[PDB]
């Protein structure tokens, strides 16, 4: 504990993700909306916006 900053123990956690190349099982808190047919809409499917 006596040592100054730069030698003190630091806990490091690395979060690693993959982007869109497989079916996703981890998602954000965003609520699902109903589906609409035959109309121009801006949709978000699993983080893919179109």
């Amino acid at each position: 504990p006596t040592y100054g900053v730069g030698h003190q123990p630091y806990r490091v956690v690395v979060l690693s993700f993959e982007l869109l190349h497989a079916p996703a099982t981890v998602c954000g808190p965003k609520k699902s909306t109903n589906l609409v047919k035959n109309k121009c809409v801006n949709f978000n499917f699993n983080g893919l916006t179109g």
């Binding site: 690395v14 079916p23 996703a24 099982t25 981890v26 954000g28 965003k30 978000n44």
Partner: protein
């Protein structure tokens, strides 16, 4: 040398709480925005702790 790897899958992640209580001096993201994590879906999530 023997860093712990935990797989994260089949959960909905709220990243807001990580911000709400934080002792983390460094919160640096490389491939994704910190604020946009709530709006995205991911897979192949791994947490590496050392």
């Amino acid at each position: 040398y023997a860093w712990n790897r935990k797989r994260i899958s089949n959960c909905v992640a709220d990243y807001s709480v990580i911000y709400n209580f934080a002792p983390f001096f460094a919160f640096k993201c490389y491939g994704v925005s910190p604020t946009k994590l709530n709006d995205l879906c991911f897979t192949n999530v791994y947490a590496d702790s050392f």
